[PDB]
Design a protein around this ligand. Structure first.
Ligand SMILES: [Ca+2]
Ligand SMILES: [Ca+2]
Ligand SMILES: [Ca+2]
Ligand SMILES: [Ca+2]
Lengths: 48, 98, 314, 79, 52, 52, 79, 52
């Protein structure tokens, strides 16, 4: 996670993408419906 | 560059939700104990504490990746090919050879 | 199969982190994603409202439909000139279709889509780092009049292009507290005039049914232990992260993402031609540049000591 | 007890103070609603003659809603 | 918003004037993490604000 | 006095080695990171960390 | 031939793609204009009954100008 | 006010256009003490201004 190649696929339209971006799901706190989460930065952006 | 996808949450009023394996990239799922969530219009479930919410988040390809994308390559031994302008007498020739 | 018949869809109510009054609140103009990959600065904005259509769902360039605040789950339409986009200053609007807007914006730190006037004069803001972009090896502020032509990619202004698709799912349940009466000690349910509404309760036992009139209801003392919602809505709705999903969250259709990225030619400045001073086994370059420009050198032998500097000034 | 930034309902629960006097019932007995002095009513919430805030569509629907039944009064809605 | 001066003005009418004073107004944040606006999800800290 | 809402940073990932740990931190906006030993002397540090 | 960035006229000369379908005769024969389906007209550009984009002043100037002769028609310009 | 371009425009009417040229406009001051606008009290220096 957080570096080049964090998401890979055999082709653009392949259906077997595999990635590891360090997704973390958090416990909701506010009353209204929500899906709080956090993630590593885009490794592609970092490499660029 | 990836584009995170967070599907609409699923909630059960008085029950239990269980994670299920999926083949999507970096599919991450969790189940939370008591929520009692709200929307525009007030509460959505009747149970005061037995409310269960399930969160999913996987990763897909960004819509603009068809142009801004990178390809990884493994390169073996390089082969060399040249073009020549061999001349002799009053005749000139052009040819390519490896 | 990607469909373009918008009559089968409908807008929805997102959860904007920053409403007009600088506090999170439910809004009809929630920003979902903001994409900026064009080389000319234009951006693509996704919004929970629908632009370029009337209430019935047919095509109409001058009107946009959105979800009303009333409890009857109704769709309202309004003239489109009330809609504006801004980051730090006003943004020039370019195209619009469905959930998506295409606007050109100056540099800023947040993207805001707002309704200027009318009954619902709301706003919505999402953090996003919009920065000035340029093509080539020489910085500029707008494309100059004279220069060479490079290869650049810009968002197509036409609204018939496609750059992908987005899923469309069945609408979820939506309970409204307005359907609960709680007169003295008993919870009463009243449908909104002539509609069929369902109810669920857990007043000691799990009770569920469909009613179309006043219901006394049994064993319930507090309004908080019952819910009521309608089921005759059938228009599909985006896969939003702010909606309770239906029991069957299977994809029902797909929608085009307009303004595909296309290759074209841009214009870039030519720097002032440097002056070369020649000495023994070395040259001296006299450079001038009002804006940062790139100068790279490399030897032509086995060793290739490479330099890369952003010369500015004189 | 709980830290003063959290209000304690008369049931045994402590919630954040932003939920007090917010128009929404969060305590199981509704102790965080009928205690403050707020009296505002939205545009869609018609104010009954007794001062209670009731949704406008409730008016003259054929059944009494307010304590004095102002909604069913023929004066308010003419048949 | 952040700025370098504070201006009060009467926009329209016969007495249309303005006033300005030099005052540094900077973006303020609470806690140990800079942010643009209060995020939807997070912990609650203790802060002091002017009463409306 | 009242309560505000403040962001929670991305939880770091610790890499453990002999007599020392390594933190892998990500932060889109400046964030504070302070450390202090629990011994007789405390080598307190403070740093505003941005980026990965 | 030339690179795809520049369109090639039916003469042997390549011009940049920016001049393709711009309302201006760029190639020596104008082949760069008779290939797209642009049909917009300016405010001062009256649209003839055959769809031709012609200047408004060109209408009813005493001699036929359009293919169908709608310019000199008495209906468009009463005498 | 300071900026990086200068623009002349016709706001309304049929001929609604605009024009813009690259030009650096920076805040200027006289003397040896920077300021935002002429303060109420101070000594008088020699400057040059365009005649209205
Ligand atoms: Ca409350
Ligand atoms: Ca009634
Ligand atoms: Ca042309
Ligand atoms: Ca004529």
């Amino acid at each position: 996670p957080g570096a080049f190649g964090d998401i890979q696929a055999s082709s653009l339209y392949a259906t077997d993408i595999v990635a590891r971006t360090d997704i973390r799901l958090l416990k909701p706190s506010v009353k209204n419906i929500h899906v709080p989460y956090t993630q590593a930065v885009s490794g592609y952006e970092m490499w660029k | 560059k990836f584009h995170t996808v967070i599907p609409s949450p699923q909630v059960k009023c008085c029950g239990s939700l269980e994670c299920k394996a999926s083949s999507k990239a970096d599919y991450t799922c969790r189940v939370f104990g008591g929520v009692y969530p709200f929307m525009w219009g007030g509460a959505q479930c009747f149970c005061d504490s037995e409310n269960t919410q399930l969160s999913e988040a996987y990763v897909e390809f960004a819509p603009d990746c068809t142009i801004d994308h990178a390809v990884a390559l493994k390169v073996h031994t390089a082969a060399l090919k040249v073009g020549l302008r061999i001349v002799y007498g009053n005749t000139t020739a052009h040819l390519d050879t490896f | 199969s990607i469909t373009d018949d918008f009559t089968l869809t409908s807008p929805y109510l997102g959860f904007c982190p920053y409403c007009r009054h600088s506090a999170p609140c439910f809004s009809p103009i929630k920003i979902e994603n903001v994409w900026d990959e064009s080389d000319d600065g234009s951006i693509r904005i996704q919004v929970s409202a629908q632009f370029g259509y009337n209430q019935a769902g047919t095509a109409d360039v001058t009107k946009f439909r959105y979800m009303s605040y009333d409890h009857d789950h109704d769709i309202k339409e309004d003239s489109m000139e009330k809609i504006a986009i801004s980051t730090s200053g006003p943004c020039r609007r370019l195209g619009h279709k469905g959930y998506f807007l295409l606007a050109q914006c100056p540099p800023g730190d947040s993207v805001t889509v707002s309704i200027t006037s009318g009954a619902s004069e709301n706003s919505c803001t999402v953090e996003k780092k919009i920065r000035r972009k340029f093509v080539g090896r020489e910085e500029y502020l707008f494309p100059p009049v004279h220069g060479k032509l490079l290869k650049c990619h810009i968002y197509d202004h036409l609204k018939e292009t496609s750059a992908g698709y987005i899923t469309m799912h069945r609408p979820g349940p939506h309970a409204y507290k307005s359907y609960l009466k709680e007169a003295s000690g008993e919870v009463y349910i009243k449908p909104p005039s002539g509609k069929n509404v369902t109810y669920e309760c857990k007043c000691g036992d799990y009770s569920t049914g469909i009613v179309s009139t006043q219901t006394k209801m049994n064993g319930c003392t507090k309004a908080r232990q019952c819910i009521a919602y309608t089921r005759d809505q059938t228009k599909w709705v985006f896969n939003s992260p702010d909606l309770i999903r239906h029991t069957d969250h299977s994809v029902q259709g797909k929608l085009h993402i307009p303004f595909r990225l296309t290759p074209t030619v841009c214009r870039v400045p030519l720097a002032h031609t440097p002056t070369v001073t020649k000495w023994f086994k070395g040259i001296t370059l006299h450079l001038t540049a009002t804006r940062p420009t790139l100068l790279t050198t490399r030897k032509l032998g086995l060793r290739a000591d490479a330099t890369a500097e952003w010369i500015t000034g004189t | 007890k709980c830290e003063p930034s959290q209000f304690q309902c008369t049931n045994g629960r402590c919630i954040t103070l932003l939920w007090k006097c917010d128009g929404d019932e969060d305590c199981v007995d509704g102790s965080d609603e009928k205690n403050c002095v707020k009296k505002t009513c939205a545009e869609s919430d018609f104010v009954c003659n007794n001062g209670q805030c009731v949704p406008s569509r409730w008016k003259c629907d054929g059944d009494p809603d307010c304590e004095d039944g102002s909604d069913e009064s023929p004066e308010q809605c003419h048949m």
